[PDB]
């Protein structure tokens, strides 16, 4: 069984949330799996959701396709998307995200570096 690394909620705006989950498979110490999960507890759907991510060049990032681009209102089906990070040199993980989507007929563009990444995700 893999180490139990706590989830990290990284974003909340008008009922839309983004959460990170982390898995460090013991059989491959250089690998970190991050699953992003977008949820929506507001009264309006999220559409055209795209999450872009960047890591320091000391690390490698791979993005899987997301489960979808819509998060229905009132706790609808979440979007999940897998990030594969390879970090053999145990460099400090830094992660910058760019979220773009439509919500309440507004174009949303949010960009930020993720703070409070658990050290277990890279040590």
């Amino acid at each position: 069984g893999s180490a139990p690394i706590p989830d990290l909620k990284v974003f909340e705006r008008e009922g839309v949330q983004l959460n990170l989950s982390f898995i460090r498979p013991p059989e491959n110490p250089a690998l970190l799996l991050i699953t992003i999960t977008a949820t929506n507890f507001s009264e309006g759907d999220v559409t055209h959701f795209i999450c872009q991510a960047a890591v320091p060049k000391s690390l490698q990032l791979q993005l899987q396709a997301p489960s979808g681009n819509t998060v229905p209102a009132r706790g609808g089906l979440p979007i999940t998307q897998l990030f594969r990070i390879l970090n053999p040199n145990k460099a400090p993980l830094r992660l910058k995200l760019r979220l773009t989507y439509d919500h309440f007929h507004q174009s949303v563009q949010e960009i930020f570096e993720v703070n409070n990444l658990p050290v277990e995700s890279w040590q």
Binding site: A53, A54, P56, K57, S58, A91, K96, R98
Partner: peptide
């Protein structure tokens, strides 16, 4: 170490 948005 530099980054990139793809």
């Amino acid at each position: 170490p530099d980054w990139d948005f793809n």
